[PDB]
């Protein structure tokens, strides 16, 4: 039906992002080619293709549709969410310019418990777990008790157990944002993986590899690897300027560490709040207009080597505030590095 199936979906021509499933994209359609497209789309499935350049991408489902004729042109304003990754097969460019795409739906491998086949029948009843850290030593003794019947030990079976992985990820996430450790993140592995990938400070090529990973467990196991191996963040361009390091990430507000903020011109800036940054030159004089973190004053910050924008250096206006100097670094500019292969 849908998984591992070859469909054709139209392509928003002006697009490029690596759309991680579950992310949302705002959209403003001016040219009549794309306006007639979304018109057909919302009449039909309203799922279009976000080409992730190259031969991959993610289908995006329109969930908000608004035509607000303004400035004497039929502007259609839409919002979509990312559903399923895909590998392109054939791109056919229509006469209108709207490109159509034969598409192979990438896989989302749902997998049973590692102990589903070895679980002893008598032991099947004593499984449902009754609703600190000794709990996880006990969790591991119980769930993987039947591992003694196999040729591998319990602690290996835990390195592939979705529930154990998701907690290891969520604990490290807690060092960045001491905050909601519950509804904040999802409960299904398939969603929890795609959520972690969209709120990690990773570059587009790491996103793209997590997106190509088939099973949600392999995707978690890798997300855990990135959080353990790629602990130094560098300049994406000159690739020779360590900016910050994993232990300096915090979360100034309750919205995350690397939340997404909007400048007064609609540019979005996943900005990873860190405590200390290095090898950054400050461009201009501090300002507080449109300051995303009220009470701090922003100063543009670029690389000391290639002068490529990295973020801002936010300064405490008052004296009560703590911290007083932090730095905001846009995700676009960073690149994770291992101070060695990422595994799955």
């Amino acid at each position: 039906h849908d998984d591992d199936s070859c469909q054709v979906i139209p392509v928003l021509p002006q697009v490029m992002m690596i759309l991680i499933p579950g992310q949302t994209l705002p959209l403003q359609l001016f040219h009549p080619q794309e306006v007639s497209m979304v018109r057909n789309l919302i009449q039909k499935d309203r799922t279009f293709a976000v080409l992730a350049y190259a031969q991959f991408g993610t289908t995006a489902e329109i969930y908000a549709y608004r035509e607000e004729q303004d400035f004497g042109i039929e502007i259609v304003k839409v919002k979509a969410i990312g559903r399923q990754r895909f590998k392109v097969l054939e791109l056919r460019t229509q006469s209108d310019g709207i490109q159509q795409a034969k598409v192979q739906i990438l896989p989302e491998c749902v997998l049973p418990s590692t102990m589903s086949a070895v679980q002893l029948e008598s032991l099947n009843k004593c499984q449902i777990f009754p609703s600190s850290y000794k709990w996880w030593q006990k969790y591991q003794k119980r769930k993987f008790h039947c591992a003694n019947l196999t040729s591998w030990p319990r602690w290996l079976y835990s390195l592939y157990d979705a529930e154990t992985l998701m907690d290891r990820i969520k604990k490290q996430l807690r060092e960045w944002d001491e905050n909601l450790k519950d509804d904040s993140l999802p409960s299904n592995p398939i969603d929890f993986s795609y959520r972690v990938a969209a709120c990690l400070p990773i570059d587009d090529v790491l996103r793209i590899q997590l997106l190509k990973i088939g099973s949600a467990i392999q995707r978690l196991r890798c997300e855990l690897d990135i959080m353990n191996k790629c602990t130094s963040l560098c300049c994406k361009q000159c690739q020779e300027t360590e900016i910050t390091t994993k232990n300096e990430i915090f979360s100034l507000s309750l919205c995350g560490p690397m939340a997404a903020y909007v400048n007064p011109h609609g540019y979005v800036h996943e900005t990873l709040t860190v405590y200390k940054a290095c090898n950054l030159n400050l461009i201009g004089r501090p300002s507080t207009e449109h300051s995303w973190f009220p009470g701090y004053a922003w100063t543009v910050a670029q690389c000391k080597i290639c002068a490529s924008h990295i973020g801002w250096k936010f300064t405490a206006t008052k004296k009560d505030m703590s911290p007083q100097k932090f730095w905001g670094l846009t995700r676009s500019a960073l690149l994770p590095t291992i101070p060695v292969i990422l595994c799955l």
């Binding site: 540019y267 461009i283 490529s308």
Partner: peptide, 26 residues
Amino acid sequence: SLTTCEVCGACFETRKGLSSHARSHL
């Protein structure tokens, strides 16, 4: 005003410099 960067907000003294900054975003 004609010297502020739309993307990061940097206000240069000269337009002929804000153009050199404009490169740095791609």
